[PDB]
């Protein structure tokens, strides 16, 4: 029902997760680990001599469930994902197993006094994500991201991976600055077959880095970018060199580049302002370190309104990476094939109550399947005949639509 | 003024300053002006 | 000290009572007087 | 047992026979006189 | 004893271990936490035929220890160990030795310890480092390992017709070609790569890769497919990384997915490399080219068994990880310097691998030509000369490499309190 | 008080993080953990008024990080801990403040947890990413690390008498040389490199290369050695990685193991860097080389010293470190911009820095030429700085440099529940 | 009614006289899943099983025979069998 419920659910299962990790090879006959008699528990909050059981049960009655759509139709309208209002619907899964869950108001006040936690877990729960995602929340300020996920299209550059070929191939003149990021690093510079001289240059901030935060950096110069050649650049220098150094409007002092220093700094500044000491023929500027979304900014990632661009590149907040299992359970008993098909209507259909009138836009054919959400979620932010805000509001829902699966589906086995 | 929230009295009631205001040199229960006289003297003893 | 010597709290292990008769046995030999530790902790003037 | 009256009754008269419970309760006149000035102390006309 | 009661002690000692560095400054004095009563009771069951409840752990901890490398340090006790039977069978044999009777015996609670091992395997984020137990049950019971569990595929890497090497390829694709030669399958510690090398263009069509082997029971969620130069930061020649905003788009397929899969595309993809054959669509020519997949690896449900057992393996010589056991032995290595035993140690080991390795062949007699290049300690070299013995056939050498791998396994964990001064 | 009584109750903050990040959203309605059970209790042992459950945690965690403010800016308060002897001796000050009373006193069972902590050296996995805790006590007390803790190398790093630097060496090793220059050792995150680059051929044979004085603590296992060249992805010239199936073996040995270890091979490794020197022997000549050590790197047993009591220094200036710290003042950081402070803190962590700086130097006054080229979070900088002081001796700067530290790390803590209003 | 179990609210004295729940839970489903593995299943099944596949989805024993033509649909290439 309520969107709040089937998250608290969703929350409770994957409680129920962490903690069977927890007791793999931790459950002895002569104890009962604090873990195991929480785990004990919380499976007798779902309604036990077979866990198995009533949890595969849980999935199965799911997967009929979601698989169609007079049923879990109202989850697909407009206002489940818009308000905390009450469902009309009654259907026993529903009654069965969702139903609210989470303490309150505890249950919250320690998910704030989180954001603020030394060491936040490095690979988040859906739950976390569907927050912001849904209600945007808050992530814990501490928390490490990959950039390249963070970016989205701009006005000068399509893509990030794609300018890999561009970047490769040496230059004619002096081009244009680019702003490329990769799993652990920002890359930013300027590429020419000819000297730029030494001076001051202005880099702007894309929209989407203009978020993060580095802490324990190494500032460097490079001619790699997802270990490929960079050319039309050259890092070389002398132990003469003039010192090359560069300021953000965030701090009031000069940081180094090529030095043995961990350095903090934010680029929530909008640009980076660059002292070349020396003239380069082509230079790749790197930032390495750990990076953080910027307090209180994480909603644009997630609220995909850092989408400005049509088309667009864009990630799948890493619901791919929890699909696996449920898919692995899917080719073990053929569905994979009718939960697909199905899963093409649950798409279809959620498009559908989204636009009035109430019919499948024109020129709409996916190109990938409903688990490959980073593509679908494009090939929906690209429709051009669609407005943009509700083009967004599609993908945020079928996200969650499909973070849900990723929880629920789990211990799928019919037979 | 609240000196005193009534939630944290056993006896359920609000401590306003109104309500200690015109009582001896009328400054507020929780912050009574103490004779500290012999202080120094009970220090030295260890007496509380 | 008791807790000390033994790791945790007795109390994780022993009946509360039987903990309390070895403080006591203590205590009062360290001040000279049969003492009762329960007294001091009664619910109300009026209830022991 | 559900099919016969008499049968239900007595097996239920037996299953009751033999719980046995046993309670602790503090001095009833004192908790009644504890609460009953904190009823007194706070009240602005004979509370029922 | 049993090979499952020596399992289900390491396992416990495992635990113990586990519990210690949750304990580690969280003892506060006045609050007895569930994790220190967890470590506590633990503790107790370690000692259990000597104790109903423990104080301090600093001394059974050590004994046990202690007595454990005094144990399989003398062939003449933990002999029973390196039978051919002891890792086939569960069948309860009866040692007369102090350490077995003491600290070796059932732990793990039956068969509730299994049913939540399998509910694991689903679990949505399993641990991303696992213990040694889990490795123990898959290269002896052969049992799976959880699906959503991320692996290295260099690690998978085995020797196959083709390329009889991964690391050592690193030298051949760095030398400019002559001819258009054979493709390349190798792989790295975060991404997987295959491509074709020539120093004339490539004709802009379709070309078909076969997955290999040891990589045939791969499969990525979150990857980036890019065209790239370099392998483990070393540059690949005859390869070209240019492309053009004009260039015709280029996809592959793969016999699970019925959609082509698109390259050097900002999109996070999913796919399985089981089931076949890759097959690449070049939209544009390229002279020499290497498709990269970065992402997260996992290895298929059901399909561990392959490289845990040995199965990977088709030809020898052949070049093979150690399942990380070297991970693990640096605590007790550490102990053993602290009190120079290291030496001696070292040639206890070497007489346990030879004795154990005698016991497999009929007739009972160290193979002819049995060098080792590498001590105990140094597994991954150790296993790869086992497993090139031409005189004795493959299943054995097979057993072999994984017998000896769980004794190693077994003294990474029980051996690391060790100090007998 | 106590130097002790401030880490007991640093390390009790920590483990309310700790615990506050296992429960969130693991707060159920029926249900009763022990982690919450844990954190609910720890909540209480803060506030020395009081001890009722508390309805809402955030309350006196804030009261505290507002107290703490209040107290580290006023240098008339935080003063006692700004002398010499209290990063020194466990000897309990004669200071009154509201702070320290209510807030700081011993919290850690003992004896107890310090055996946990020593059992936990030992123990399998550690945590790889430690808490606070206990860098704030190697780098005070000067204790142990555990034993398989892993590391990233470069942190490791500091400079020497050859080479200045690390990263910067970097653009060197790019540039082609000029005729055949002296060995470089530079480390990246996760790989130790090392080699001599030449335009001209060189002979195949035996070279000596002398580790280190920071590289001579690392150890490894499970590495993968082998020629490449790259350093932190930038191309490294003068060097070739080219290489035959006819190339005859190219093996390099360490003082600590009697046998040889292969290179450019896909056999997983384990050795020491402790023994002083590696001995490497090409097998065929080659126009410049680079060998690449990738694997876990780990700080040998007893050794962490060198690096947490910045005993590696050897030369002025130096690259150093900073003990990850920033990575953990993000938080108080971004607490700070939002309400306005960021700014007036710096200005009462300059005079923090200087004052302590002061009483390090009898006759008590400040250095000259104290310039402070960054502001007090970015540390790695400000440690380069307090280092490259001439006019005081080596000894003191170190001293200076890691009582600033367990300052700094110390308020990272403590300040993040911090809203004034 | 054809897509859950939900009990219905009609009151006609056939349904109340005859339909009520008559099946053994959960033990007739394991010992209808523990079939599937059997041995010689019944080569003419019940239309129970055929109710269950039908309309559940459910599995059917995995040794029952089948005359393939049955099995048969129209594809692309043959639009019948019989008529071919």
Known sequence: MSRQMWLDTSALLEAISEYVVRCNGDTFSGLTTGDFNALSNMFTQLSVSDPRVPLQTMSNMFVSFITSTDRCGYMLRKTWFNSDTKPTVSDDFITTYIRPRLQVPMSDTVRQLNNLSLQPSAKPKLYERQNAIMKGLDIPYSEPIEPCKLFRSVAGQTGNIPMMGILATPPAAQQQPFFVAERRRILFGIRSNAAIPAGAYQFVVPAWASVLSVTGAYVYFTNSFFGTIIAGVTATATAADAATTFTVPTDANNLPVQTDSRLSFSLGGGNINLELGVAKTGFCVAIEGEFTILANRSQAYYTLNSITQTPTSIDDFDVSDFLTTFLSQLRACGQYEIFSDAMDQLTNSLITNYMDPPAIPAGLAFTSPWFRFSERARTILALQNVDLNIRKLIVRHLWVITSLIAVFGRYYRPN | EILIPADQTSYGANETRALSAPYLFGAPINMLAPDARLSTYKRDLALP | ?48 | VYMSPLALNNLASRLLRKISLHLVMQMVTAVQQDLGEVVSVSSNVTNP
């Open chain 3, 1 to 48: 000290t008791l807790s000390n010597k033994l790791g945790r709290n007795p109390a994780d292990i022993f009946h509360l009572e039987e903990v309390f008769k070895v403080i006591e046995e203590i205590v009062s030999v360290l001040v000279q007087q049969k003492i009762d530790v329960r007294k001091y902790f009664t619910e109300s003037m009026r209830s022991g």
